[PDB]
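Box 3.1. Reading complex inputs
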Amino acid sequence: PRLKNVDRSTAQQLAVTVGNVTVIITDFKEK
Amino acid sequence: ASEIELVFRPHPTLMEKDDSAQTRYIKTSGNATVDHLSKYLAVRLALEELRSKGESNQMNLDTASEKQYTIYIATASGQFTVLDGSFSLELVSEKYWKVNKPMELYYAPTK
């Protein structure tokens, strides 16, 4: 299931840490 | 370069006038928890505030955390269930979403 209304090239990353677990959350601008 | 995709929408009734109410479009690993998503909402807002007019800024990027947002998912009962911060997105997808589409979550500032 992929988003269809986003501009993929706008991808921006945030490393988010809670406790000792870090994930990368990538977000997009609507197209 | 990532896994579950989802759309974050402002809660339909809890939002107030001066609240940041952006719809956000994201992807991340299934092992991210609800607390990571909450913290993400706070950090992204904090970043946007850096260039904002600043009348009701609420975030300091340095201290933004999972405590600043409550996350909900809609149910077949029409209920908006609050998701526990410890839940992984894979768990939420399995147990609450059950649809072959990007997950739809709602948020509201705490509270």
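In summary: The CA atoms of residues 7 and 25 of chain B lie 5 Å apart.
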